[PDB]
Amino acid sequence: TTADLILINNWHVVANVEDCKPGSITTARLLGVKLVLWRSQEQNSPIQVWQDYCPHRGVPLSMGEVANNTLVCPYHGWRYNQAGKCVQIPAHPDMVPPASAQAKTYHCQERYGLVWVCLGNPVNDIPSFPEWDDPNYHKTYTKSYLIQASPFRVMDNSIDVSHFPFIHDGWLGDRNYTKVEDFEVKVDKDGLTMGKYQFQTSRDDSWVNWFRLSHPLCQYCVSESPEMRIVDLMTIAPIDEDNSVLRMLIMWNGSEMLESKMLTEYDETIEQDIRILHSQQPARLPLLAGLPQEIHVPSDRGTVAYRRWLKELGVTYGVC
Amino acid sequence: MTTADLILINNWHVVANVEDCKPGSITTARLLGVKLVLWRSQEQNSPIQVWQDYCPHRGVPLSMGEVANNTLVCPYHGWRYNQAGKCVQIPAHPDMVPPASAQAKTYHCQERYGLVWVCLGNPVNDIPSFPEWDDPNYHKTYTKSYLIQASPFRVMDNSIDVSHFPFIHDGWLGDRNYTKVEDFEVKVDKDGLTMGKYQFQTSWVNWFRLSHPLCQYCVSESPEMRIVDLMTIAPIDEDNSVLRMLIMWNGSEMLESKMLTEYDETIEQDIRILHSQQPARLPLLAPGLPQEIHVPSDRGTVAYRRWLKELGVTYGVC
Amino acid sequence: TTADLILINNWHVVANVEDCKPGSITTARLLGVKLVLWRSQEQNSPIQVWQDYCPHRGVPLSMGEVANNTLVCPYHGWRYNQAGKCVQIPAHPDMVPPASAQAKTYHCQERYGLVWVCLGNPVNDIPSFPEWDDPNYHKTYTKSYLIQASPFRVMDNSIDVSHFPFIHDGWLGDRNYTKVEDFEVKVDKDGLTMGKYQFQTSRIVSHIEDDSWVNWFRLSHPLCQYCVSESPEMRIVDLMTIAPIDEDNSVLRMLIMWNGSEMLESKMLTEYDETIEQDIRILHSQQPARLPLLAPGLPQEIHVPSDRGTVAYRRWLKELGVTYGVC
Numbered sequence: 001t002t003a004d005l006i007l008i009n010n011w012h013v014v015a016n017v018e019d020c021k022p023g024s025i026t027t028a029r030l031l032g033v034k035l036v037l038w039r040s041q042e043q044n045s046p047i048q049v050w051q052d053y054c055p056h057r058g059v060p061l062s063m064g065e066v067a068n069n070t071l072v073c074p075y076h077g078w079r080y081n082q083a084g085k086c087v088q089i090p091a092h093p094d095m096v097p098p099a100s101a102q103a104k105t106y107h108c109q110e111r112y113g114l115v116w117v118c119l120g121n122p123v124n125d126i127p128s129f130p131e132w133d134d135p136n137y138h139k140t141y142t143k144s145y146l147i148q149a150s151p152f153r154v155m156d157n158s159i160d161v162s163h164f165p166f167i168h169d170g171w172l173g174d175r176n177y178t179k180v181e182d183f184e185v186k187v188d189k190d191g192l193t194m195g196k197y198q199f200q201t202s203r204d205d206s207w208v209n210w211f212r213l214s215h216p217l218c219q220y221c222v223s224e225s226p227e228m229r230i231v232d233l234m235t236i237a238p239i240d241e242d243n244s245v246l247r248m249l250i251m252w253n254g255s256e257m258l259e260s261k262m263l264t265e266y267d268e269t270i271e272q273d274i275r276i277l278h279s280q281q282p283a284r285l286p287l288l289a290g291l292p293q294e295i296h297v298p299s300d301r302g303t304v305a306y307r308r309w310l311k312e313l314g315v316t317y318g319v320c
Numbered sequence: 321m322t323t324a325d326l327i328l329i330n331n332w333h334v335v336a337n338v339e340d341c342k343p344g345s346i347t348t349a350r351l352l353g354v355k356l357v358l359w360r361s362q363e364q365n366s367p368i369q370v371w372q373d374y375c376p377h378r379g380v381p382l383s384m385g386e387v388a389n390n391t392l393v394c395p396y397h398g399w400r401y402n403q404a405g406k407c408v409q410i411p412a413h414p415d416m417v418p419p420a421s422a423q424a425k426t427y428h429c430q431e432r433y434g435l436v437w438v439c440l441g442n443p444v445n446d447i448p449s450f451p452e453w454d455d456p457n458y459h460k461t462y463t464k465s466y467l468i469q470a471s472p473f474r475v476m477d478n479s480i481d482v483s484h485f486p487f488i489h490d491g492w493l494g495d496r497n498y499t500k501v502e503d504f505e506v507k508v509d510k511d512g513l514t515m516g517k518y519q520f521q522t523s524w525v526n527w528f529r530l531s532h533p534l535c536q537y538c539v540s541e542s543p544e545m546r547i548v549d550l551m552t553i554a555p556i557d558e559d560n561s562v563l564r565m566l567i568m569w570n571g572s573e574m575l576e577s578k579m580l581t582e583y584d585e586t587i588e589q590d591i592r593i594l595h596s597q598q599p600a601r602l603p604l605l606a607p608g609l610p611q612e613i614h615v616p617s618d619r620g621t622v623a624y625r626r627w628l629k630e631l632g633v634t635y636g637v638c
Numbered sequence: 639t640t641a642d643l644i645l646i647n648n649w650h651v652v653a654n655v656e657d658c659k660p661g662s663i664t665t666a667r668l669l670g671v672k673l674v675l676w677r678s679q680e681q682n683s684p685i686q687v688w689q690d691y692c693p694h695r696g697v698p699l700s701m702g703e704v705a706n707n708t709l710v711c712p713y714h715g716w717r718y719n720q721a722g723k724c725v726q727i728p729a730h731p732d733m734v735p736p737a738s739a740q741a742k743t744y745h746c747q748e749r750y751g752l753v754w755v756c757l758g759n760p761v762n763d764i765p766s767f768p769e770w771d772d773p774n775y776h777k778t779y780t781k782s783y784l785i786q787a788s789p790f791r792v793m794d795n796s797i798d799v800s801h802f803p804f805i806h807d808g809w810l811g812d813r814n815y816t817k818v819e820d821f822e823v824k825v826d827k828d829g830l831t832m833g834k835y836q837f838q839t840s841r842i843v844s845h846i847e848d849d850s851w852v853n854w855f856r857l858s859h860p861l862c863q864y865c866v867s868e869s870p871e872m873r874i875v876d877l878m879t880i881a882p883i884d885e886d887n888s889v890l891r892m893l894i895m896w897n898g899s900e901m902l903e904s905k906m907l908t909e910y911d912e913t914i915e916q917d918i919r920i921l922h923s924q925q926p927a928r929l930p931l932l933a934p935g936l937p938q939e940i941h942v943p944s945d946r947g948t949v950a951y952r953r954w955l956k957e958l959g960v961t962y963g964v965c
């Protein structure tokens with residue numbers, strides 16, 4: 001559709017690299033734009049990410065097929081090379097295709113095993129994830145979670161910490177320890193950082209957490225106990241103003257065998273969050289100024305800072 | 321889909337049956353485009369709270385929470401709201417007095433006739449009268465609720481209409497062999513709309529009164545017994561209704577199953593018409609479809625449309 | 639609904655006559671209008687096509703019943719004769735029904751075994767289909783295909799010929815024969831005509847070696863197409879009609895005739911069913927849903943020479959004043 005510039009000119013994850021096999025075609029949606037992702041059959045071939053649209057008669061290129069190093073539209077068979085240019089119009093095999101005959105292409109980077117996409121001019125870097133190449137850390141990926149909520153509501157819920165003893169009771173919080181101790185929040189040029197805060201729970205029931213968003217739809221979260229360190233990179237694909245795809249990449253320095261339990265814990269807490277997110281009204285995130293206005297208490301300082309940050313960045317897409 | 325019409329916002333509407341609201345329970349309803357939460361504490365004889373179904377902290381429906389002692393507890397961060405709607409406890413700051421704004425939006429509620437009546441505005445008018453409720457000679461019964469995809473004013477218009485009886489109610493309220501409708505009287509004044517006595521030839525004498533444009537008090541009488549009912553139409557929005565009937569009669573109590581079946585048969589015969597009617601809003605008088613036609617036997621539905629215009633109704637009409 | 643007079647003042651197929659038995663009641667939708675089709679029980683009774691609406695309290699007359707030569711509303715039993723005039727108000731059997739007690743009636747004509755309807759004042763005539771009266775030709779009707787696309791996109795796809803060797807590979811074309819030979823197109827007093835166009839394919843309805851086919855078509859009406867497909871061994875003609883339900887939905891029907899053995903009917907229906915469904919898969923996917931007209935978000939349409947017919951179609955639609963379901 002017509003997102004804002006801080007969104008258009010930023011990188012977003014739209015798929016896992018394992019979803020794009022050689023020779024394959026897959027689809028995604030980002031900020032209202034339909035995307036086609038494709039690869040040739042060659043070893044280690046790159047991923048192309050284009051608007052899913054043939055400009056001849058408006059057919060989705062994702063309904064075609066990969067032939068050699070080209071994507072072929074199914075309707076009249078126009079072939080597009082890896083750079084998106086039409087190289088052949090079969091009805092007129094000796095005709096030079098017109099210059100307008102070209103797919104709209106976008107920037108694509110593989111990083112952390114994820115497929116990152118920028119629909120505009122990539123002025124920002126992909127958020128950093130320092131544990132990625134650390135040999136002491138194993139990795140696992142959650143499945144994708146399609147969520148019927150504004151992406152900025154999804155992230156709001158991920159910055160919120162006082163909800164742990166309620167919807168995450170027995171997982172991330174304790175019904176009997178509801179008080180939220182003071183913590184610090186800074187918004188500056190590194191984005192939003194929420195400082196260390198302790199919360200009592202087993203998954204050894206003492207975990208210190210902090211997290212940083214250099215990017216309003218990506219969160220780097222660190223949770224450390226004396227026994228082990230777990231970090232994750234949470235990415236929210238903003239499908240449109242009202243729908244999101246959540247993905248989490250998780251790394252931990254404990255035993256490799258803990259993987260199956262890691263995914264079960266995340267799956268349980270994510271679905272606990274999704275139940276709330278689908279229920280929230282209005283579905284779009286209200287900024288700081290029918291339905292009453294939002295109320296803020298001191299433990300909301302992080303989510304208040306998020307709303308202030310979004311207003312400062314000029315976000316108008318998926319908010320109110 | 322909400323209204324400012326005073327005769328609607330400043331009036332009482334049935335949203336539920338009291339049997340559906342047990343102690344410690346949480347139920348939901350919609351009225352005039354507003355989502356409601358109904359809840360009671362676990363105490364015997366506890367009152368029924370009727371609030372907008374909405375936590376002002378982060379906008380979660382309160383109806384997804386639980387009842388704890390005398391409070392409704394939001395599931396997201398556990399804020400606790402007392403029976404008066406005031407937040408009494410915010411668990412992340414156990415010693416803090418909640419902000420004054422930490423309050424549920426509460427509505428007037430009154431139990432009457434075994435029904436839960438709600439006023440979203442300023443309760444000017446009283447709940448409709450139902451004289452037989454106090455008469456120990458009359459048994460009572462409640463139909464199930466009927467959700468109807470039609471304007472509430474179309475639903476009431478169909479309930480004031482009498483000439484359709486020999487057609488869609490053939491064999492139940494009329495007879496296809498006696499289709500002529502005899503003369504009858506209708507009055508609209510300070511007490512609302514009153515339809516005088518009428519009767520249909522078959523092979524029962526009736527009258528009814530509306531003081532409230534979405535409630536109807538019906539009287540039907542035979543030599544054998546007398547039946548009265550209070551039909552209420554909850555206006556969910558401009559295009560959807562919930563119809564309920566409270567039926568009272570002074571014959572044998574054992575007639576209950578048959579009466580419920582007869583009502584069910586004729587109500588469903590009406591719903592088949594109501595769901596099909598075009599346009600869905602009720603057309604008022606003298607305003608790509610032609611204007612309605614009125615014949616003498618439509619005098620009651622004509623008077624109903626005149627009454628709604630005098631009352632200034634704009635919601636659910638056209 | 640549309641003010642476009644070329645649509646309102648034209649004829650459109652809404653049913654097959656075989657779908658309208660004596661005494662029957664059926665429904666259809668046309669240009670946003672809900673229709674009721676009904677016939678008396680008498681043999682050879684005419685077909686009435688009315689707005690599906692009782693002017694008393696707004697009930698669909700299609701929910702009623704046919705009694706003698708009247709259609710009876712189910713709600714209060716008012717009876718409407720074949721001309722749409724209410725002749726009986728059962729609540730007041732002696733009253734003179736008011737002049738307003740009258741169904742909205744539309745012009746209806748049966749032609750080629752199809753039910754044609756005009757919602758307005760018919761300027762144009764029903765398109766002509768010369769082989770209808772030729773006794774050398776056998777006929778068959780496809781079933782009706784409901785398509786979630788603009789009627790003008792559906793017709794665009796039927797005027798298109800370069801797509802045959804791709805989505806009709808193995809049926810109307812050959813992935814080894816993708817070049818589209820030159821052909822002519824005219825927009826004039828006859829409407830839109832595509833001149834003879836030869837293409838390479840063997841077909842299920844003819845001999846293995848009979849693989850050089852020649853197509854031709856004419857539209858005098860923007861949503862009906864008369865197509866002729868001819869080889870040295872056989873000649874096949876069809877009348878395709880597209881009923882514009884609304885701006886975004888259409889019903890396609892095809893009446894097929896051929897100068898050959900009546901035994902070929904099953905293979906004829908198989909070929910048309912296979913190819914129509916291949917077209918529908920594309921039609922459902924195209925964006926935007928309305929047909930973009932010519933004009934020197936989404937990029938603009940690109941045109942190459944083999945698009946000369948679909949370009950002429952878009953030009954013709956602007957000359958005719960079409961605004962419904964386009965752009």
Ligand SMILES: N=C1N[C@H]2[C@H](COC(N)=O)NC(=N)N3CCC[C@]23N1
Nearest residue numbers: 158221222223230231232234269270
């Ligand atoms: N499902 C979730 N589990 C939690 C873990 C805690 O962090 C770590 N690194 O274990 N990760 C994470 N990103 N957050 C943000 C909100 C709470 C949570 N969401």
Ligand SMILES: N=C1N[C@H]2[C@H](COC(N)=O)NC(=N)N3CCC[C@]23N1
Nearest residue numbers: 479538539540547548549551586587
């Ligand atoms: N289904 C319906 N049964 C009838 C009964 C009247 O019968 C009694 N016994 O009061 N109740 C009622 N509200 N009305 C209004 C019109 C006809 C009717 N609708």
Ligand SMILES: N=C1N[C@H]2[C@H](COC(N)=O)NC(=N)N3CCC[C@]23N1
Nearest residue numbers: 796810853865867876878910913914
């Ligand atoms: N599904 C379709 N089958 C075809 C038949 C004859 O076509 C051929 N090529 O024999 N009839 C017809 N009107 N048309 C227009 C487009 C192609 C076609 N659509």
Ligand code: FES
Nearest residue numbers: 054056057073076
């Ligand atoms: S629509 Fe893609 S080649 Fe024609």
Ligand code: FES
Nearest residue numbers: 375377378394397
């Ligand atoms: S949303 Fe209700 S307590 Fe936070």
Ligand code: FES
Nearest residue numbers: 692694695711714
């Ligand atoms: S609505 Fe058709 S007869 Fe009354």
Ligand SMILES: [Fe+3]
Nearest residue numbers: 157163168273
């Ligand atoms: Fe959570």
Ligand SMILES: [Fe+3]
Nearest residue numbers: 478484489590
């Ligand atoms: Fe009725």
Ligand SMILES: [Fe+3]
Nearest residue numbers: 795801913917
């Ligand atoms: Fe085709």
